[PDB]
Every structure is written in C-alpha cells, then in structure tokens.
Amino acid sequence: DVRPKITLACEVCKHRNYITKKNRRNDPDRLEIKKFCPNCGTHQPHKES
Amino acid sequence: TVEVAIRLGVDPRKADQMVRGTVNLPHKINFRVDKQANLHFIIGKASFDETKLAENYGAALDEVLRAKPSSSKGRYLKKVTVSTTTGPGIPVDPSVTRNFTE
RNA sequence: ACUGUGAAGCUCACACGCCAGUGUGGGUGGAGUCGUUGUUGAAAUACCACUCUGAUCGUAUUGGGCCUCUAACCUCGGACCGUAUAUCCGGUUCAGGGACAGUGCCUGGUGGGUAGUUUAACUGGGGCGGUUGCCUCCUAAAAUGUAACGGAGGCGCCCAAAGGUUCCCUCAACCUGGACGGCAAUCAGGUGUUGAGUGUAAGUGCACAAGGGAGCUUGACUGCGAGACGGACAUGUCGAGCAG
RNA sequence: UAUAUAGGCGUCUGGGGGGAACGCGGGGAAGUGAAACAUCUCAGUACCCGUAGGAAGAGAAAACAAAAUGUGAUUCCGUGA
RNA sequence: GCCCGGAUAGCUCAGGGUAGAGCAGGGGAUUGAAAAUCCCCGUGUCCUUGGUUCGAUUCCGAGUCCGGGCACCA
RNA sequence: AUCGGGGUCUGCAACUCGACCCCGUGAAGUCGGAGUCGCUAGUAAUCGCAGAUCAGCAACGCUGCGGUGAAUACGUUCCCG
Ligand SMILES: [Zn+2]
C-alpha cells in the first residue's frame, strides 16, 4: 500500500520492539536498522518482519 | 552396492521448500532434493556391519530432520529404503528417530 | 554382473513405432558385453536403488448409476361383510404402483404473499441546489476570543533521507566577452543585502542563515519528567533535567 | 371366513355440570423502555387450554463441600447482595 | 476473504527445444479494366517481475488490469 | 562492379560529362517466385567482321556479312487473333 506499516524485530532475541513505515517501491528489500533493544539491554541490529 | 534414499514429503517446485543435506559421521557427505523430492545418502547393506552403518546413518537423519521445511504439509519421512545392489525390499522403519542403534 | 541351474550366432512370435528402430518371450549351438570409450547441456543403455510421464494388470477398502422382485407403504380401481337403512368409516379378497411416493429431523435456494420498521440536520417558510471533519488569511473594532447559505484557498500525503551531527559556501536579477548557442544551456569578469529558495495552501520566520554542498551515522530510542499553555467535559500542546 | 376378530344382545358399577381466591402442567402477545429500532426489555406478565386439594407441588442423595475424619430428605423465612 | 477463467502482430484467435494463421497494410503478377485467386515482404517487450533447467510463450512465486460464483455482527 | 594513383588520343576547351592503357583494390552473383517470351532448317543456339551517323565517342543500339550449326511436331481437347 505504497507506505505500509512494518515491524522491526531484534536479531538476537527476536522481540518486536518498533513499528514504522517505509516506501515499498523505493526500498523493496527488508529494512536493516540498529536499534536499542530493552530485553538485551544494548544496541542490536533489527530487521523487518 | 547399498545406500540410503529417503523420500521427504515436501514440494520441490517451490523455492522456499528446498533441502540441502550435509553430514559427516564415520562409524563429509552431501545431499539435495531431486525433481521428485528425493534425498540421497550413503549407507550399508544387510550383509555388512551392524553398529557401524547404523551409527553413521543417524547423523545424516538429524541434519535432515533439522532441515524440515517450515511450510511442509503432511508426513515428512514417507519411506526409507536401504536396499542392496540386487536385494529387494530391505525397507527401514520410518518411525524410528531416537536411539537408532539399539 | 552374467555363462553349460548353457553368451554372442542365427531364426520364430508379439508390442509400440517418426520402422529411427528398440523391448519381451521362443528354437539350435557355446562363451558375452564391458571400463578412457569419439560428439557431449549432461555418459554410456555394465548393472543397481528411489522415482516422473502415460498405458496394463491384480488383491482390500470404498463411493455412485441402472434393471428386476414382493413383503413394507400407497390406490376416490372392482366385489363382499358390519348393515334392514348408509357415495361416511372399518374389515376381507382380487387388480395395479412399489422400496418410489408421503411424512419426521437436518440442510441449501426463490420468496412484497404476509409482518415489524428505517428513510439526518442546517435552511431569511418547506422542496430543488449547496454544506457537515482538520489547517491558513481577512471580516475581527492594535491582548485572547467573536456570527451569517460572508470573501479566498488547502488537507485525508510524502522523505530510509528531504532525519541526527560536524565542517564549508551565498542567492535572484543586470552589464560586458565568448564555436555551434538563439532573450534564455556550459565558461570568465563585475555590480548586486535579499527582490531567489525553503516537498506541499496561506500566514509568521529564515542571509547569523531554517537556503546550497560534502563525510560519518539511525535519538524516526528505553524508565521518567519539576513547571506551564489551553480549556463545560472528553481531547490537545510545550518542557529544562536524571539514568541506561 | 376356516382359526378367530370387529360387531350384536343382557346386566351391574362409574362419568357429565357449578364455584370468589390459593396450586400444578402446557400455549403464549402488544401498548412501553432503549429519547428512533430489529438483538434485549416489557414478561413467562395479560389472556387461553387440561386438572386437583383443603391445601397443592417437592421430598429420602447417581447432594454439597474441599483435603477439616466436614455437613446428612424436602419445603418456607432473613442475610450473603 | 475463498475458488476458477482471460492478457500473444494494426484487429481476431490457435500453440520444455516452432512464435503461428486469417482479416490488414506494401511491391510485383494475371485483365481491355477490377475482385477473387497467386507470389514475395515488414510487421511480436507472448501483461509486468523474479525463481527451476543447458535451455520456459509453456513449470513455480509475487504483482497489475479484468469477469463469474460463495462468504463478511469492531 | 566500385574506388585510389599514373598515363595516350581528338577536341580552344574532357569539373558537372569521352574512350582507351597500366598498377592496385576486388561488391553482388552458387542458374533465379507466381508468371512469361522467341523459334519448324542453314532455322533456333552460338562466334567474329563491316557500314551509316561521326573530330572523339556513351554503340552492350540500328543496318548487313560470313563461320560452327541442333531437338521436336501425337493432334485441335483448351487460351489468343
Ligand atoms: Zn534483543
């Protein structure tokens, strides 16, 4: 839907920590972002579910 | 001679539903899903060692059992055959998955 | 891997067949193919195990479609009896239909034939027309607020950078000289203080730059939050600062 | 119509109907409220049908309870609320 | 939401190792002159993307435009 | 064929526009679709020579010469006059 809602999950513990939007035509591939994960307690890579 | 050829119940045509077996157990082999969704391995025959071939076969199964496709529907190990060069039959029991050598 | 529990070699039958020719069994004899084989997408058809395509058989399970039969059930078809009177009813028997039809429970359709109801408000009377939420300006009377079917517009998005941070720069317009080249493309010099530009309406701002360029990155975080703005309420808005 | 049945005679014993309220078992609305209305309420009310008794229905665990060796048929009051 | 069918030349429509045919258009034939017959041409991202294979218009996945039937009590 | 270079002749004059000579370059073309033309004997097929026009030729055209010289005609069934 051009700009759908996406959810970012930690790569270590796999907890859904954030939700955001991206353009699915400008950025067709799964987003990769470093975000603070409270469960781990530090900054871990996050990937689109 | 004799070998191992399992019939994993997966859809080979779908790209996601694919298997790539790779085990190493002497008691570094490779495997893949054929067109008809069949897996190939190396085993012994009935007229051979008892605790040697059986122990080596367990490691290959575990890698395959850990490689079951997520979307696979139905029974996974439909049949297993370890028949010899000319010896017909010799079909193993697919139920056994823990403590194969006993 | 096969070979006198008899191959090649011939000859007999059938199957498909684009007769390209292969496969199966039969009769005589008596020792075969085959491995690097040579073109190869890929190798030998030495053989083997799993298996696809269609066509063949078999067992066991399993659903339908038909044709009969009489015995359930059905007949406002005939004849007797209860019955002296009876086109009611019941019983007996003959003649037809027949596991169908009818009915009970479950289930899918058509269903104004019937029933219960809905069909907004504003409005210079009602209807037709137009409007209903959010953002910006004027009316608005130099704090805030202020109406009319008063005057003008925009929105129901977009950007993985057009966000964060560090460093650097000054536009638009005009004049003059230059191959195509022209009012107007790229280049050089000069005047030039904001007249350019800020994703998108308008307003308030921004040249100190919030405008232009480049390097690294994800704070487009987690637990909180003194003190306030605004308000019938429900909503809404700003925020220093502490820790990770 | 044969076994026999339906029926036909004779004789004894019962029933029918009425009543104000209370009872038990069935069938069962709408006005109204929801500031509209269909789920819902009104309400198992109004009304109707079948039957009683001086009262009726229920009643003697195929029950509660929760590790306490607890209660011990049913009915009706007050709390639990 | 679920299950099928369609997308191929200017137009219409057939199809694991071929992209084809009729109406079209063009040049040349036959005729005193035409049509139809003839010959020869150019016409094509096989809806758009990726996957398997030495190789896909053909098999698989996603998406776009369509069409039919059955679902839908914030 | 095409093209580069160097030459000969006529013409006052070879750029648009002559022929010929030499050196080099070396395209298409592997017998040609539907269709279509000529010929019955010195003919068709083929080979060379001369003339007109004319200074020079675009002549592979036109008019004549001679050399070597074939196959076939069942018959009006069909097209044209
Ligand atoms: Zn984590």
CSV table of N, CA and C and ligand atoms in Angstrom, one decimal, chain A residues 9-15 17 35-46, ligand 1:
chain,number,residue,atom,x,y,z
A,9,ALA,N,12.2,-6.4,14.4
A,9,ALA,CA,12.4,-7.4,15.4
A,9,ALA,C,13.9,-7.5,15.6
A,10,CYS,N,14.3,-7.7,16.8
A,10,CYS,CA,15.7,-7.9,17.2
A,10,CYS,C,16.3,-9.2,16.5
A,11,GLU,N,17.5,-9.1,16.2
A,11,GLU,CA,18.2,-10.3,15.5
A,11,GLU,C,18.7,-11.3,16.5
A,12,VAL,N,18.7,-11.0,17.8
A,12,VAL,CA,19.3,-11.9,18.8
A,12,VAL,C,18.2,-12.6,19.6
A,13,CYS,N,17.3,-11.8,20.1
A,13,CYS,CA,16.2,-12.4,20.9
A,13,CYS,C,14.8,-12.4,20.1
A,14,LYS,N,14.7,-11.7,19.0
A,14,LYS,CA,13.6,-11.8,18.1
A,14,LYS,C,12.3,-11.3,18.8
A,15,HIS,N,12.5,-10.1,19.5
A,15,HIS,CA,11.4,-9.4,20.1
A,15,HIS,C,11.0,-8.2,19.2
A,17,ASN,N,10.1,-4.8,18.7
A,17,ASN,CA,10.4,-3.7,19.5
A,17,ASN,C,10.0,-2.3,18.9
A,35,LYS,N,18.9,-0.6,16.5
A,35,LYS,CA,18.1,0.0,17.5
A,35,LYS,C,18.3,-0.6,18.8
A,36,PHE,N,18.0,0.2,19.9
A,36,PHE,CA,18.1,-0.2,21.2
A,36,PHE,C,17.1,-1.2,21.6
A,37,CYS,N,17.5,-2.4,22.1
A,37,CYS,CA,16.6,-3.5,22.5
A,37,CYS,C,16.6,-3.6,24.0
A,38,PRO,N,15.5,-3.2,24.6
A,38,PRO,CA,15.4,-3.3,26.1
A,38,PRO,C,15.7,-4.7,26.7
A,39,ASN,N,15.3,-5.8,26.0
A,39,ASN,CA,15.5,-7.1,26.5
A,39,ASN,C,16.9,-7.5,26.6
A,40,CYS,N,17.7,-7.2,25.5
A,40,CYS,CA,19.1,-7.5,25.5
A,40,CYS,C,19.8,-6.4,26.4
A,41,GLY,N,19.3,-5.2,26.4
A,41,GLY,CA,19.9,-4.1,27.2
A,41,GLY,C,21.0,-3.3,26.5
A,42,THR,N,21.1,-3.5,25.1
A,42,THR,CA,22.1,-2.8,24.3
A,42,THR,C,21.6,-2.6,22.9
A,43,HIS,N,22.4,-2.1,22.0
A,43,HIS,CA,22.0,-1.8,20.7
A,43,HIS,C,22.3,-3.0,19.8
A,44,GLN,N,21.3,-3.6,19.2
A,44,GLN,CA,21.4,-4.8,18.3
A,44,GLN,C,20.8,-4.5,17.0
A,45,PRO,N,21.2,-5.2,15.9
A,45,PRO,CA,20.6,-5.0,14.6
A,45,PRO,C,19.1,-5.4,14.6
A,46,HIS,N,18.3,-4.7,13.9
A,46,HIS,CA,16.9,-5.0,13.8
A,46,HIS,C,16.5,-5.2,12.3
G,1,ZN,ZN,17.1,-8.1,21.5
